[PDB]
Structures are given as structure tokens and as C-alpha cells.
Design a protein around this ligand. Structure first.
Ligand SMILES: [Mg+2]
Lengths: 202, 48, 80, 139, 83, 54, 168, 190, 52, 116
């Protein structure tokens, strides 16, 4: 109706009274308390108000000579950052969702449950037909030595029945090695210093 | 020691999150076009 | 743009850098091989993964002859 | 027309000066399509008539890089036709003129990798590292 | 798997008609592929090397069924233990 | 000293009071579940489309 | 090179090309201003900072990026941005069947009617006429040429004549 | 509708006579899926058009896929694991439809699915949330890997032997069953 | 091969979307090209607001 | 050839109904002739400065003094058909503004927050 047109214009400007400056805007944390429906509602309140204000600003700009400047301009600023803050909050929530989604999706992928032709995938060991063997060794062995020694004797292939051989140090002994070599460097430093300090007195 | 040259603008939240920096920049820019505060122009070339 | 930059070519060995590419095979014209695995790996993790039998087998220096490309001189030793 | 006193020809002298987006589109291989070589040299399992998932296949395989796939496994015997896009992947991804400054000064010859035109920082210590590396040797 | 490795070219079919109308189809690294069943066995250098290979795989399985493979591997393990 | 300023500015009709504005409506787990599920749907959908054209 | 120049007396630095390039930025704030089709790096990189954090945050799966839920599309669907503003001189004390709106140029004739229906509840709109007017250019007192944003003038034809009265 | 627990299918292998398999359905734990399956077995195609209706439509509206497991096939049959069929728009194994739309979803039903016993029926789907007409009958002892993936809406109460019968069909190089396994007729036992 | 190619497609996309386009983190020409003098600063952003 | 359909190069009918620049919401299957590539950069400018002179004596696209932005056009929502002047092939590109109202405490909310 015409009542819809009145919201574009300023009420107290319409009655010629001075527009008052509002107390402030929606801060971030106040919006953090709000749910999504509330957020988009006050978004639309801010939208209607902002449109109203823009129309007013342009009207005063339109007749500069007669009207002067726009009374209580500081509202625009307020309302703008209000909207900005809403965006902020929403962004945050979205990215949270996104993160969560991602880690779900990927753990689906590593389960490998998707197949283009609609249906279940084949069961997880049906295809593998391989067996891994864990060996402990006191010393280090070159892997080719292990490959000739543990290779199938009946298989005639250059691999001799061995798909691959991988050597590792457990992380316990690895940590042991780095700790020990730190102590070794400090040791060399200390014996060097002992020799260097007491060289002169001796 | 500065992580940006002294003459750069500060565009960021008070927390330091750069999440909104493009909105902030856009805002500052539309604001440099037509400042909301702006009083009567004394120029002969006037927007209306 | 290149997703998955390919690894250096001959880098199979733990404590010593690969031979210069183009000698193994590829584009010629640099005298030193380099691999970011062997560089980024801390010195202690290099020494931890080796022994003084293996170290001296890949420390081995064939002087002018090149191993991977037989009969010719090794490129690093050549001026160009 | 770019020559005039008009403002369209005034813009065209200026607007046409900015530089377009550049990516290195490295050439397509229409006749050797690496992605169809997965099905090469595979034994058939004759019940299901599907391929046999051979565990030896994946260590002999040669990984052929490209842009819109990560890498493509290919049997080794067929690797020899793909020699160029192995050199385009290892290449720096620009015109070399843009990155050429790495070449001219001395400090950047020693710190940067030049193998088949990949200009990329070698591993280089920080200063505190250098200090504590030279200190515990007592030098 | 091999048929998937040979290069396919996208062009006219009638120019393909034209080039083996002439002798142009075999020249510039182009060749035509007609799947065969049996081959020429003499002077075929692929054939000979791989049937030699078959011969040593046959004598290898003779060695396996006889059991010297077992003994060789066991003495390898023995000399590894002895060293 | 403090920065005390015009407290003489106010707009009661058009302003939200504090007890109104500070009400927490954010229950996060429920709406989080909704969001996450409807991201999941699209991610899965495009992935199965990729599977299709592969 | 019938005769070689003396090039050994110059240190190596690239001279500026004498037909010097003008800066790529567009200085003309008039009527005839052209939008530059050419895309620089900065556009894409700022996209990438805007949509997800590109420097720091890991990129989301493509399926998300190309979907309605992806943040700039999500936020656009549930938190729309338009300044649809009204020229008051059309609706001031005269009865007018045709109020005149300023509109962001990316709106159609349909989207305006949707806007007025669902937000302002203006349910009778016979039709919309659309002009694209370049934003208002002005100089200030230092002589800085400034241009307010481009707009779309929509004459909106109603069933019932509408006035907004001014109390004198 | 609980007492609609049973729907049956007549399965023919090539030129073989149709043999009946009778399902037992679990409407309480998953109403949506079962509601789909039942009505796909019933299939009211009972709308018969007229001359003027033919002139008015001018599309021949029976040209759409008609939502019945009749004249549908088992496209994917594999030994020891399971048997899958039920695509309506074409019998070639892709392209799901459901009664509700193209594909439906029921998140709280999918989470609750457990596949433990053989002769168990579930929806063949591409993703946990796109579910069509396609079903699979699980012949293996335990598939525990489909849990958060599929949805179990029923079991085979009668005709297990029919399953094992059509499971032994040889597969030709095309990847399908060499002998065409067709669903001749369907009905709900109410 | 189908699933693996799909997966490699996905991570290839996300990495090429991570690594492109490549704009340097810092170069001296940023501070060089962003320095303006005082006259240009005043003649860039001035409004009536300061004097009023 | 051309990705964009051929009715926006030469017209859908004889009077050149559908030619000009067309921008697409990039969630939509249909595609426009606005491409920012170097090789396309001449002809988009060729529309913005010249416009096109149709053989029917009327100059399409930009005939005037104000060159149109191809970037801020509203999205291409369909394709022209001779019967009904414009077919909407895609409705999902038209923004339907929808606002939740009179829910909960929403009535009490006001555009600004007060002071202490
Ligand atoms: Mg430097």
C-alpha cells in the first residue's frame, strides 16, 4: 500500500522534527549469542532501515541549497558496521561447519564407501592376496641382502616373490638416537673445554 | 619490528582476524566516494 | 602451475645427494645434485638411518668415470 | 581505432596496458593419453572378467604428472614417450625472464636450484642455527 | 593390456583412405595395426629371446621339482649364518 | 582521566534494550548438525559425479 | 652490425622504453568510462582471500565450492544485499502512480518486483521501466574527481496512486 | 502399514521358469525405504487413457518410467557376496529413481543400519544419502563394512535357494550375467 | 582405478587451487609503489569534514 | 567454435533480438559470451565501443553515448524463442528475496542497540 512507502521515508523528518541519534550498534559477541533465524531477521531490519537512510541521504544531497546537510548522519556508519558484524558471525559459523564437514567427508573417503555404479563396494580384503612380515634385527642389514635371503626359491621372476622390502627404526630407538647424539655433541664440547681451560695451568 | 610499512592503512578487526578485510576495504572505499558526514560542498561542480 | 613437482631422479640412498640430473637422465647443465628430502632431514636422522658399512659404500668416489652413463667422463668433473 | 581525441581511444591507450592472468598450460598429449595406460599389461581374472589387482604393478609404475590430474601411474616400458612433460613439471612455472634475478647475483646462484630450470630455494640455515652449529664445535 | 598403448590420431577417415591408397600411411612414424594370431618365427628377434627365456624357466622348474632350488637357498642361508 | 562523552543521545523507539539484545538463542549443536549435513550432501554429490565421468 | 656499438661503457640496466607505457588505471570519471575486461593476478588472489583464507586456511573440496551452500552464495541467498532506494520527489505530496527507484545495476525487472513483494509487501505492480544511469560525478574543493556508484532508475507502475504527505 | 511385511518376486534366468522369492520387511525401523519398496512391487499403472486424452496429452504419458520392478533385471550378480538389481529407467545398472523423486534420503535410518546375517536386503546406493529403487540381497556371512553407508530395510524370509540359484550364473566379458536374470512379476502379500 | 583417479582429480584441483596464482609474499616494490607525498595524500582524500 | 550459443552472435530472429553481452551466474549450466580471456578481449570491447550494426538498419547493444558494463548486467536467465519472446530456461538464477517474520522475539528487535 502507501504504508509500505512511508517506511522508505523518515517519520520525524516527515513531521519536521529533529531525528535523534541512536545509542549504538550490534556488537560481535551480542550477535554470537543469537541463532541463525534471529540473525537474518535483524539483517532484514537493518536492510529496511539502511534503505530508508540511503533514500534520505540522497534526498538531502538532491536539494543541497534548500535542505542543507542530512541531520544525524552517524546512523549510516552504525548500521553499516552492524551488517558487517552480522557477516562476521555468519562467516565464523559457516567455516566451523565446513571444517567439520571436511573431516567427515575425508574419513568417508579413506573408508572408501563410494562407488559410481550405485551399490556397495566389494569387501575390503577380497582383492589383496598379499602378506606383510615383520622382522626384528639387532644390527642394520642392506635390503638386497634381505631380498636374496627371504626371496622365494621356487618363484622364477627377478623379484622372486617379494613385492617390496621396507626398513624402519621404531620411534623409541629413534628418539634414543637423537637424545644420545645430543649428549655426544655436548660431550665433545665438554672434553674440548676441559682440555682448553686446564692446558695453561698444567 | 614492523610487519607492514608505516604508511599502510590498518584494515583488520581489533582481534587481528583478517576474515573481513575485503568488507572493511570496500566500506572505506564507498566511504571515500561519498562520506556520510559530508557537509555542503563549496564547489561549482556538485553532485546534483 | 604444477601440482606434484616430481622428485629428484636417482635419489635412492639415505645420506648422500643424488647424482646430477641429466647424468642419470634428463636435462644437462648443472654440476651438483640436490634433493630436499636429504637436505631437510636433520643430520642425526641421516646418521641414525645408516651404518659405517653403508656410509662408506655410498661415500664412494668414482673419479672421472661416471657410473650411470658408462664409458664417458662424469659431467660434474668436466668444466661445462 | 586507437588514434583520436576521443575518450574511448584515451581509455584504450591505458586500459590495454594491464597484464592478463598467466598460468603455464603445459601441452596436451592427445595421442598418448597416460590415463588409459592403467589398463595396459594387466592379467585378467577369468570368473568376473575384471582386472587382476597386481601388487607388483604399483612399484614398477612410473608417475606421469599433469595439471588436472595429480599423477598418473604408467607401466615403465611406456615411460619413454612422456619425457617432455616430466621436464615441464620440473620446470619453473613461469617465463624464466620473470624469475631471472635468481641467476645474476652470486648469493642466489649458490642458494637456488637450477636443475632443469626449477628456480627454488635450496635448504638454508637460519642465523641462530648457524651460531649454535659453530658454537658447539667451539670455533 | 597392450592395445591401449598405441597412438590414436584424430583426423578424417577419407584422408586415411587416401594415404594407404598411396604408400603414405607407413612413412612418417605412422604405421597401421592389424592384430595377428601366429607369427613369422625365423629371424624374429623378439620371439627367439623370449622362447630362450621360456627354456630357462622350464629348466628352472626342473631344478625346483628336483629340489636343488631348496638346497641352494638353504646353503645360501647357511653361508649367511656362517659369515 | 576517562573519555566521558554525550550520553544525551538516545533513540528509544528505534533502539533495542539490553535485556532484549543479550538473550542467547544460539544452541550451536543442532544448527551445526544441519549445516554440516547439508555441506556433506553437496560434497558427496560432486564426488559421485566425478566417479561417474571417470 | 656493420659496426659494433660501444656497449662496454654501459653498466647493465634496462632503459625505459621511449614510447613509455601509461599506467593501467582508468582516470576518466566521465560518461564514456570503460570497464576493463583484462584480469590481473590481484583479482583472483583477492577472490581467494575473500572466499576462504588462501594464505593460511586449506581449500574446501571442489564439491563445496561449486554448490549453493558455499559461503558467498549461502550468504547471498540468506542475507541479500541491495540498496533499493526511492526518489522522494516522485512520492512527495503529489499523488503518483509511478514511484521512481534507484537500484543496484545487477537487478532485473523481475528481481525488483520480487523485492517489493516479499520485503515491502508491495503487491500490485503493473510493470517496471529500467534505465542505467552512470553514477553521479562531482569535484570537491581540492578538485578531487569523485564518482558516486552507478545506479539503475526504475519507474515502477502501480494500480493505486501513491503519495507521501509532508506536514508543513 | 505393518501387515504388509511381505513382497515377492518371480525370478527367471534366461529361458528358465520363474521361481518365487519372498521378502520380509521391517517398516518400523525404516518407514521411508520400505514404503518405497512395497509400492514399487505394487505398481499402479492402472490409468488407461482415451482418444481425446491421447489428443490432449500428445506425449503418450506411459512413456515415462512407470515405477514397477516388473520387467526389471539383476544387473550385478557376484559370487559369494551379493546380488543386486532393481533399476527401473533402464536395466543396465545405473540411473536410480525412487517413488518420492529422483533420489530420497533418510539420515537417521542410515546411521542405524547393521549388516550381520546373510539373506539381508538393503538399498544399493552411490552415496549414504542418494537412495533409489535399486536393492541388493546380501549372500555373504558378514558384511560389517556397510553400516554408515547403506540402509537395511528387510530380509529374505523365503527363497534363499533362489538367491543361490541365480548367484551361480556365469558372467560374460561384458561384466553382466551371461544369462539374463529377469524379474517376471511382483506383488505385495498384505 | 576409477576411485583412485577421482581422488587424484580432487586433490590435484585443491593443490592447483592452493598454488595458483603465485604472488610473492613481499618485494621492495610494494613499499616503493605505495609511497605517496603529502600533497598527493591531501589531494587524494580530503573532505569538508575536517574543516567543519 | 564458440562455447556460447549462436543466437547471441547473430539474432534469434531477423531483427537481431538476442545479441549482446550475457553474463552467467556461475552456478548455472547455461553460458554467456562474456569471456575475459586475451583472445576474446578485442570483441567484447568491440561490443562496448562500437556495438554492432545489424543489416536491419538498427544498431544493437550500444548505440549511444553511455557504454554498458558487461560485468554488472543481471545474469542470463534463459534463451529467446520466437513464440513467447523470452523462455526462462533457469528460474533458480532469479533471486527470490524471502524474509522470516513474526517468529519468537523478533518483533521486539530494533535496528539499533541502546546505550547502558
Ligand atoms: Mg636475495
Amino acid at each position: 500500500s502507501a504504508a509500505a512507502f512511508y517506511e522508505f521515508v523518515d517519520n520525524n523528518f516527515l513531521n519536521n522534527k529533529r531525528p535523534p541519534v541512536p545509542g549504538g550498534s550490534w556488537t560481535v559477541e551480542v550477535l554470537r549469542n543469537k541463532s541463525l533465524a534471529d540473525l537474518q531477521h535483524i539483517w532484514f531490519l537493518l536492510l529496511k532501515e539502511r534503505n530508508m537512510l540511503k533514500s534520505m541521504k540522497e534526498h538531502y544531497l538532491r536539494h543541497q541549497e534548500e535542505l542543507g546537510a542530512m541531520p544525524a548522519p552517524s546512523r549510516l556508519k552504525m548500521i553499516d558496521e552492524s551488517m558487517r558484524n552480522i557477516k562476521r558471525v555468519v562467516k565464523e559459523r559457516d567455516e566451523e561447519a565446513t571444517a567439520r564437514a571436511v573431516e567427515i567427508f575425508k574419513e568417508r573417503l579413506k573408508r572408501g564407501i563410494y562407488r559410481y555404479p550405485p551399490g556397495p563396494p566389494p569387501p575390503p580384503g577380497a582383492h589383496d592376496k598379499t602378506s606383510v612380515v615383520k622382522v626384528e634385527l639387532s644390527c642394520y642389514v642392506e635390503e638386497e641382502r634381505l631380498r636374496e635371503l627371504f626371496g622365494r626359491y621356487d618363484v622364477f621372476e627377478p623379484h622372486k616373490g617379494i613385492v617390496r622390502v621396507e626398513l624402519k627404526l621404531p620411534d623409541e630407538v629413534l628418539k634414543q638416537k637423537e637424545e644420545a647424539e645430543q649428549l655426544w655433541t655436548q660431550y665433545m664440547a665438554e672434553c674440548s673445554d676441559v682440555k682448553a681451560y686446564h692446558q695453561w695451568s698444567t | 619490528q614492523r610487519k607492514l610499512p608505516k604508511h599502510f592503512p590498518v584494515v583488520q578487526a581489533s582481534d587481528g582476524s583478517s576474515l573481513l578485510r575485503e568488507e572493511t576495504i570496500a566500506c572505506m572505499e564507498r566511504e571515500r566516494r561519498l562520506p556520510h558526514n559530508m557537509g555542503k560542498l563549496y564547489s561549482y561542480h556538485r553532485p546534483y | 602451475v604444477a601440482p606434484w613437482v616430481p622428485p629428484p631422479r636417482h635419489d635412492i640412498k639415505v645420506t648422500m645427494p643424488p647424482p646430477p640430473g641429466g647424468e642419470v637422465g634428463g636435462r644437462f647443465g648443472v654440476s651438483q645434485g640436490y634433493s630436499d628430502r636429504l637436505a631437510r632431514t636433520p643430520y642425526w636422522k641421516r646418521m641414525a638411518l645408516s651404518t659405517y658399512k653403508l656410509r662408506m659404500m655410498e661415500n664412494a668416489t668414482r673419479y672421472p668415470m661416471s657410473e650411470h652413463r658408462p664409458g664417458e667422463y662424469d659431467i660434474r668433473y668436466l668444466p661445462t | 581505432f586507437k588514434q583520436g581525441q576521443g575518450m574511448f581511444s584515451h581509455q584504450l591507450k591505458r586500459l590495454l596496458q594491464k597484464k592478463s592472468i598467466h598460468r603455464y598450460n603445459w601441452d596436451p598429449l592427445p595421442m598418448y593419453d597416460p590415463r588409459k595406460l592403467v589398463h595396459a599389461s594387466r592379467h585378467m581374472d577369468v570368473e568376473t572378467w575384471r582386472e587382476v589387482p597386481d601388487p607388483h604393478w604399483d612399484e614398477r609404475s612410473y608417475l606421469v604428472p599433469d595439471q588436472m590430474f595429480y599423477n598418473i601411474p604408467v607401466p615403465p616400458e611406456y615411460k619413454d614417450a612422456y619425457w617432455w612433460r616430466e621436464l615441464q613439471a620440473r620446470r619453473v612455472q613461469c617465463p624464466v625472464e620473470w624469475v631471472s634475478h635468481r641467476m645474476y647475483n652470486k648469493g642466489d646462484r649458490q642458494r637456488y636450484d637450477f636443475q632443469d630450470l626449477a628456480f627454488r630455494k635450496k635448504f638454508e640455515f637460519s642465523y641462530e642455527e648457524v651460531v649454535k652449529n659453530a658454537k658447539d664445535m667451539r670455533s | 593390456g597392450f592395445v591401449h598403448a598405441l597412438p590414436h590420431d584424430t583426423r578424417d577417415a577419407l584422408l586415411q583412405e587416401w594415404e594407404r591408397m598411396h604408400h603414405l600411411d607407413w612413412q612418417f612414424g605412422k604405421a597401421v595395426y592389424t592384430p595377428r594370431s601366429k607369427e613369422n618365427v625365423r629371424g624374429n628377434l623378439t620371439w627367439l629371446r623370449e622362447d630362450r627365456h621360456y627354456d630357462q624357466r622350464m629348466k628352472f622348474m626342473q631344478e625346483v621339482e628336483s629340489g636343488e632350488a631348496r638346497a641352494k637357498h638353504m646353503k645360501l642361508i647357511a653361508e649367511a649364518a656362517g659369515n | 582521566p576517562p573519555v566521558n562523552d554525550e550520553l544525551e543521545v538516545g533513540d528509544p523507539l528505534k533502539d533495542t534494550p539490553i535485556q532484549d539484545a543479550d538473550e542467547a538463542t544460539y544452541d550451536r549443536e543442532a544448527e551445526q548438525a544441519v549445516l554440516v549435513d547439508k555441506r556433506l550432501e553437496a560434497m558427496e554429490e560432486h564426488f559421485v559425479q566425478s566417479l561417474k565421468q571417470s | 652490425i656493420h659496426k659494433g656499438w660501444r656497449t662496454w661503457e654501459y653498466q647493465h640496466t634496462r632503459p625505459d622504453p621511449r614510447p613509455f607505457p601509461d599506467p593501467p588505471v582508468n582516470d576518466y570519471f566521465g560518461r564514456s568510462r570503460i570497464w576493463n575486461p583484462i584480469a590481473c593476478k590481484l583479482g583472483y588472489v583477492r577472490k581467494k582471500a575473500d572466499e576462504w583464507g588462501w594464505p593460511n586456511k586449506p581449500p574446501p573440496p571442489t564439491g563445496l565450492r561449486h554448490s549453493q551452500e558455499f559461503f558467498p552464495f549461502f550468504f547471498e541467498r540468506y542475507f541479500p544485499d541491495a540498496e533499493v532506494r526511492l526518489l522522494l520527489d516522485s512520492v512527495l505530496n503529489n499523488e503518483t502512480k509511478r514511484p521512481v527507484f534507484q537500484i543496484p545495476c545487477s537487478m532485473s525487472k523481475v528481481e525488483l518486483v520480487n523485492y517489493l513483494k516479499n520485503i515491502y509487501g508491495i503487491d500490485n505492480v503493473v510493470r517496471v521501466e529500467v534505465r542505467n544511469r552512470r553514477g553521479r560525478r562531482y569535484k570537491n574543493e581540492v578538485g578531487e574527481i569523485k564518482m558516486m556508484d552507478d545506479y539503475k532508475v526504475a519507474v515502477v507502475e502501480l494500480d493505486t496512486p501513491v503519495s507521501v504527505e509532508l506536514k508543513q | 502399514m505393518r501387515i504388509s511385511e511381505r513382497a515377492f518376486m518371480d525370478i527367471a534366468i534366461g529361458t528358465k521358469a520363474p521361481r518365487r522369492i519372498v521378502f520380509k520387511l521391517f517398516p518400523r525401523k525404516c518407514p521411508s525405504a520400505v514404503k518405497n519398496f512395497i509400492e514399487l512391487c505394487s505398481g499402479n499403472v492402472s490409468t488407461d487413457t482415451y482418444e481425446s486424452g491421447n489428443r490432449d496429452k500428445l506425449i503418450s504419458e506411459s512413456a515415462l518410467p512407470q515405477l514397477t520392478y516388473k520387467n526389471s533385471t539383476f544387473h550385478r550378480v557376484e559370487k559369494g557376496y551379493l546380488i543386486q538389481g532393481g533399476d527401473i529407467v533402464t536395466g543396465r545398472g545405473t540411473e536410480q529413481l525412487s517413488i518420492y523423486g529422483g533420489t530420497f534420503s533418510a539420515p537417521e535410518e542410515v546411521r542405524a543400519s547393521v549388516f550381520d546375517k546373510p539373506g539381508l536386503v538393503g538399498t544399493a546406493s552411490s552415496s549414504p544419502n542418494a537412495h533409489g529403487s535399486q536393492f541388493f540381497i546380501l549372500t555373504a556371512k558378514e558384511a560389517n563394512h556397510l553400516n554408515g553407508t547403506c540402509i537395511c530395510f528387510g530380509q529374505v524370509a523365503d527363497g534363499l535357494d533362489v538367491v543361490q540359484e541365480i548367484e551361480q550364473v556365469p558372467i560374460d566379458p561384458s561384466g553382466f550375467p551371461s544369462l539374463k536374470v529377469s524379474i517376471v512379476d511382483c506383488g505385495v502379500l498384505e | 582405478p576409477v576411485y583412485c583417479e577421482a581422488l587424484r582429480r580432487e586433490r590435484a584441483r585443491e593443490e592447483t587451487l592452493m598454488k595458483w596464482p603465485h604472488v610473492p609474499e613481499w618485494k621492495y616494490e610494494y613499499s616503493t609503489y605505495t609511497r605517496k607525498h603529502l600533497a598527493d595524500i591531501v589531494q587524494y582524500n580530503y573532505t569538508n569534514v575536517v574543516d567543519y | 567454435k564458440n562455447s556460447w550459443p549462436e543466437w547471441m552472435d547473430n539474432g534469434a530472429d531477423g531483427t537481431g533480438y538476442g545479441i549482446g553481452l550475457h553474463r552467467t551466474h556461475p552456478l548455472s549450466r547455461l553460458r554467456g559470451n562474456l569471456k575475459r580471456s586475451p583472445s576474446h578481449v578485442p570483441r567484447v570491447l568491440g561490443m562496448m565501443i562500437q556495438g554492432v550494426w545489424h543489416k536491419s538498419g538498427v544498431k544493437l547493444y550500444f548505440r549511444g553515448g553511455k557504454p554498458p558494463n558487461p560485468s554488472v548486467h543481471p545474469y542470463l536467465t534463459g534463451e529467446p524463442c520466437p513464440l513467447y519472446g523470452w523462455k526462462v530456461t533457469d528460474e533458480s538464477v532469479i533471486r527470490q528475496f524471502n524474509m522470516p517474520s513474526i517468529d519468537g522475539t523478533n518483533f521486539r528487535y530494533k535496528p539499533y542497540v541502546a546505550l547502558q
